[PDB]
Design a protein around this nucleic acid. Structure first.
Length: 1129
DNA sequence: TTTTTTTTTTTTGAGCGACTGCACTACAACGTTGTAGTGCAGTCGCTCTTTTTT
């Protein structure tokens, strides 16, 4: 490998950057981005400068892409300022300014990059794949709109259940017995094959033939057993082997156990006494007959139906899942990669790759250790060897810890074998040089510490600015790495975990007890800082040991937080308390639910309070009244107003904040309230939200929004964090109590050392088990390097002679089977004294060891402080007056028109029929039939309706007898919308008396009550028309449900006007028409131009009665001026 | 077409592998007897990671 300079890197072809842990990878990416933008490098530069929309940056994590986009924007702005000023304070910016000759063109290009920074092509992998699938949809064959699903486990379980239905149901008893012996149901099969159903389907080594079913394999194994049974029945009754001292004389009893075994071939499990009939075991305890060799050949391979069922499941479930996702039209995260790989797999899609070479002629791929083989196949299809396009794989093989997710280091090894150039970052800017020297000493004990040839380790160099970092104790300067070797010969798992958790808690309380007195310090040069509880962090791997650490730390009065806690908030007691409270609010009549909800910990009442509440009837009546008020608020205002009124009236938030340990409960209550308010807007019914809350209580599924948050941020807590959640973070002091605990992989799923393909071995071959255990040990070594390279000042290790084997004292320990002991014991099996000598061999100034001391003196000291006085400002007046833009409604034989259905929708249909129809032209029956087809009414009503319309049109509506046919198109105006202002507070008592002073219809009609309305009033007049130089108004009322006879005279219409209070509407219409004719027509008189207002009841118009149906009214011409003066001011 | 009423939970780990004790034969020392290796049976620890992508 070679060293990497960001200003001398040739951006041609494929380059492989190996950025170590703690190095400035994001700074090197920003430097290369500025280099690609400005076109710097000279001979090693790009042939042409590129824009922002041509630089493709690929990073997996979305927050990492957002941080990189913000950092690149800040670097662009800083370089633009430094180019406008021709000076800077950074040496890399100084060399960047020294590399360019021109300043004005570079400043203009940086200004255009700052303006085009919003359209930057810095996306994720799946986002880039979705964008390329949606952009060039023709060559790929992708839909334009698709629905991404977050959870795929439901369809996978459905396809597994369908496979178990179509495969395990028609089996006979002799096969279903073996199927039940292999798996209890489809859940066990799904639990077995869930690591192979997702992602790329692996290639099965030595697959069964396509014509072999379960019955053929069962008959083959039955015949194989029956041949051995026949050979035992033929050669029975003889004994010719020599009797040995190990061979007891009870073997004939084992032959009797083999005498009762040959009865039927309905079973599947042979006897263990056949292990006594092996020639390789009898020779070690002279076998000449081939019956023993046939028994050994029968027991050479396990008789199992498991591999054929697993192959049929892997052939069926994935196909059913793909068919279901093609039917529903949905897509997944890996489905975008599979669609892009299938598009590039075709012949025309290669030209599509050239389109990608037309789109972005560069690629900088960050985090190349988390690369699927489909992703690298795509990136090799696009950017293998084409000119003028560059590929920059910036990654780290020592951080590939996501093999459980789908990543694979063999893809990185294939990429390293394919590319030619390698570059590495030498400087480390995070940790102290003592920790750097400890890491370079521990991992360089032997050659190829990661046990693979393509993953080399290089000694990194510490920073010059961080060479004075010292974690000092009361005695002297504490060393960097302190391997706490637990003393003993052999120990178990739980006892070792408990002892190391107690030792870690004792070290935490010793660092915190001496840290609050100014003894233990972090010193940078001469500056010092006391060690708080947030500096010490325990790095664990599993949830059980994290709970063990938390229980061993909370015993010594030390609070600790769990950063890797992914538990749902709906699985706590507070969700059940909120459910009980909502059930008491919804049904407050039954006292049982209210009594069960009042006694919860959210209310916080004693047993004496509950007894006095059951005894006193008046207090329970007050409780029922306030819960009915809460139900009224919940039905009128929603969820969060009811919850806030409940938390303010009961004052339970102050009581939960006063109680120690109730702040997390209060934050959980607030998050449950926020989720209930978020789910309550999408539901109309009130019980539906309660059923949704009970379902989400019964469903412990984890979503990104429904997870538990951090309870507090100001108070420092000991942060327990897993190794996978600590990648890229930073911690001052790190404790690793369970770094020696290891787990042996049992399944045979490995990768070939030549083809680099996933090989799944269904047979229990030892070579596949060893090749899987080698990859497991490499993953454990990578996890060890990740957990080791996160400390800055001090790291502590827990070493112990852990034995995974069940024997207590066997003379050897299994530390060589772990990751730490492979570096301590140099990959050799030793003893506890050998482990101690290997620990004491590598003793430097940075690496020390001490024995594990079990002992506690005192938990802690609280040292609490008082809280200052604080108050809240109060608003003096009301926030606003009653300003609202409202309307009039806000201030308030077989076929006949009498038999018309009375409703709002038929009223609007008749209003639209009278609006759309022309009054001059005769009514056409086909137009009425088309309008009834568009509306959806009956077709039989059409020939009666049109003649009724003509009966309406033949009836004149005027004091002189003017019909509607005499009105031209310019004279009419339909649906005039007006806005009327009013600046005074509209008093109902001052208005109703002014109406009753002039209007004769206000003799009855007691006055309506409304608030003071100041602002605007909307109105929609139906028709305004002029005739012989006089303006007239026309409105339509068509409900008229209660009349079928000719009783709709002027008295009944006046009674309807007094009941529905249309007098105010007609008076406002006259005022609006008067103001309109005053504003429009100059020299306007109200008595000269206005003629009256006509109300047209549609169901009251008769052919013989011209007066019935119409209602003409004229004001007194004195109410209009007073109403205008009142509305004006 | 009308109408009657009711308050009680319960269950749930099992195969893998060692520890220990008894019994039975092989074999050598003193026909009979003591020690060792192996098999069978009851009892008990233990144990089942990590996470994020529009």
């Amino acid at each position: 490998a070679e060293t990497l300079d960001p200003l001398r890197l040739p951006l041609q072809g494929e380059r492989l950057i190996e950025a170590s842990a703690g190095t400035g990878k994001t700074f090197t990416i920003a430097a290369l981005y500025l280099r690609l933008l400005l076109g710097l490098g000279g001979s090693a530069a790009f042939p042409r400068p590129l824009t922002v929309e041509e630089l493709l940056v690929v990073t997996f994590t979305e927050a990492a892409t957002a941080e990189l986009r913000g950092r690149i924007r800040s670097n662009i702005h800083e370089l633009r300022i430094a180019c406008l000023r021709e000076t800077t304070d950074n040496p890399l910016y100084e060399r960047l300014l020294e590399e360019i000759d021109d300043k004005a063109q570079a400043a203009q290009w940086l200004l255009l990059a700052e303006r085009q920074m919003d359209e930057a092509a810095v996306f994720t992998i799946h986002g880039f794949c979705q964008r390329m699938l949606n952009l060039n949809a023709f060559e790929s064959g992708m839909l334009f709109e698709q629905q991404l699903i977050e959870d795929e486990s439901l369809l996978r379980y459905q396809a597994c259940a369908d496979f178990w239905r179509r495969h395990c149901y028609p089996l006979p008893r002799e096969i279903a017995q073996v199927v039940f012996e292999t798996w209890k149901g489809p859940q066990a099969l799904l639990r077995d094959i869930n690591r192979y159903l997702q992602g790329e389907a692996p290639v099965i080594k030595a697959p069964p033939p396509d014509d072999e079913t379960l019955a053929s394999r069962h008959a083959q194994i039955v015949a194989r057993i029956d041949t051995v049974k026949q050979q035992w029945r033929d050669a029975v009754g003889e004994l010719d082997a020599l009797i040995e001292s190990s061979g007891i004389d009870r073997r004939k009893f084992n032959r009797s156990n083999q005498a009762k075994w040959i009865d039927k071939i309905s079973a599947w499990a042979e006897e263990e006494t056949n292990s006594y009939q092996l020639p390789e075991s009898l020779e070690k305890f002279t076998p000449r007959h081939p019956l023993f060799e046939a028994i050994d050949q029968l027991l050479a391979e396990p008789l199992s139906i498991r591999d054929l069922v697993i192959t049929r499941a892997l052939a069926e479930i994935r196909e059913t899942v793909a068919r279901e996702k093609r039917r529903r039209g949905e897509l997944g995260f890996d489905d975008m990669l599979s669609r892009l790989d299938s598009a590039l797999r075709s012949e025309s899609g290669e030209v599509l790759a050239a389109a990608i070479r037309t789109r972005f002629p560069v690629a900088m791929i960050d985090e190349f250790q988390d690369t699927d083989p489909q992703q690298y196949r795509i990136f090799r299809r696009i950017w293998h060897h084409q000119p003028e396009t560059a590929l920059l794989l910036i990654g780290d093989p020592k951080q590939a810890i996501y093999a459980f997710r789908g990543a694979d280091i063999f893809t990185y090894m294939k990429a390293r074998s394919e590319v030619h150039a390698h570059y590495t970052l030498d400087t480390n800017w995070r940790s102290a040089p003592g920790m750097v020297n400890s890491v370079n000493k521990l991992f360089s004990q032997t050659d190829d510490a990661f046990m693979f040839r393509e993953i080399p380790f290089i000694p990194v160099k510490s920073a010059g600015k961080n060479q004075a970092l010292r974690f000092v104790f009361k005695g002297e300067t504490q060393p960097a790495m302190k391997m706490w070797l637990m003393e003993g010969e052999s120990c178990g798992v739980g006892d070792y975990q408990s002892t190391m958790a107690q030792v870690c808690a004792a070290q935490i309380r010793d660092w915190l007890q001496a840290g609050q007195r100014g003894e233990a310090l972090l010193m940078n040069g001469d500056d010092a800082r006391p060690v708080r509880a947030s500096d010490i962090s325990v790095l664990v791997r599993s949830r059980q040991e994290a709970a063990q650490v938390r229980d061993a730390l909370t015993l010594l009065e030390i609070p600790s937080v769990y950063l890797s806690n992914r538990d749902s908030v709906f699985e706590t007691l507070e969700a059940q308390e909120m459910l009980w409270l909502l059930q008491a609010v919804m049904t407050p009549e039954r006292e049982n639910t209210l009594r069960s909800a009042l006694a919860t910990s959210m209310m916080g009442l004693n047993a004496l309070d509950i007894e006095t509440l059951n005894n006193d009837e008046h207090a329970w009546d007050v409780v029922v009244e306030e819960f009915d008020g809460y139900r009224q608020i919940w039905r009128k205002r929603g969820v969060m107003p009811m919850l806030r009124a409940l938390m303010s009236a009961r004052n339970i938030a102050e009581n939960l904040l006063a109680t120690a340990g109730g702040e997390r409960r209060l934050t959980d209550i607030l998050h449950i309230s926020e989720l209930l308010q978020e789910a309550g807007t999408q539901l109309e019914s009130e019980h539906a939200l309660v059923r949704w809350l009970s379902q989400h209580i019964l469903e412990p599924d984890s979503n990104a929004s429904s997870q538990q948050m951090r309870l507090e941020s100001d108070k420092h807590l000991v942060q327990i964090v897993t190794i996978h959640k600590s990648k890229g973070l930073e911690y001052p002091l790190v404790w690793l109590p369970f770094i020696t605990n290891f787990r042996v992989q049992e399944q045979a799923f490995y990768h070939d050392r030549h083809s680099f393909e996933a090989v799944l071995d269904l047979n229990a071959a030892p070579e596949s088990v060893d090749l899987a255990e080698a990859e497991r040990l490499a993953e454990d070594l990578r996890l060890l390097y990740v957990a080791l390279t996160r400390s800055v000042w001090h790291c502590s290790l827990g070493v112990a002679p852990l034995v995974r084997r069940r024997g207590d004292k066997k003379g050897d320990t299994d530390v060589h089977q772990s990751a730490l002991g492979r570096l301590l014991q140099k990959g050799e099996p030793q003893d506890a004294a050998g482990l101690r000598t290997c620990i004491e061999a590598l003793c430097d100034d940075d690496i020390a060891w001490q024995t594990a001391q079990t002992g506690d003196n005192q938990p802690w000291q609280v040292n609490d402080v008082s809280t200052a006085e604080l108050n809240a400002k109060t608003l003096q007046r009301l926030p606003g007056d009653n300003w609202r833009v409202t309307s009039y409604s806000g201030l308030q034989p077989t076929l006949t028109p009498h038999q018309f259905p009375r409703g709002a929708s038929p009223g609007t249909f008749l209003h639209s029929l009278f609006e759309d129809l022309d009054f001059t032209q005769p009514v056409d029956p086909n137009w009425v039939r088309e309008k009834l087809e568009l509306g959806g009414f009956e077709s039989q009503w059409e020939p009666v309706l049109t003649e009724w319309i003509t009966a309406v049109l033949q009836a004149p509506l005027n004091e002189t007898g003017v019909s509607l046919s005499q009105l031209s198109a310019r004279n009419k105006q339909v649906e005039m919308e007006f806005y009327l202002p009013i600046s005074e507070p509209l008093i109902a008592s001052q208005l109703d008396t002014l109406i009753r002073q002039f209007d004769p219809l206000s003799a009855g009609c007691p006055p309506l009550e409304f608030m003071q309305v100041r602002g605007m009033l909307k109105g929609f007049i139906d028709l305004v028309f002029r005739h012989e130089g006089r303006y007239y108004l026309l409105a339509y009322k068509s409900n008229w449900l209660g009349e079928d006879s000719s009783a709709y005279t002027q008295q009944a219409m006046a009674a309807a006007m007094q009941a529905h209070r249309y007098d105010l509407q007609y008076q406002l219409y006259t005022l609006a028409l008067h103001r309109y004719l005053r504003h429009r027509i100059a020299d306007y008189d109200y008595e000269h131009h206005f003629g009256g207002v006509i109300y047209l009841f549609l169901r009251g118009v008769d052919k013989e009665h011209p007066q019935q149906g119409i209602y003409t009214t004229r004001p007194n011409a004195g109410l209009i001026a007073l109403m205008d003066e009142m509305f004006a001011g």
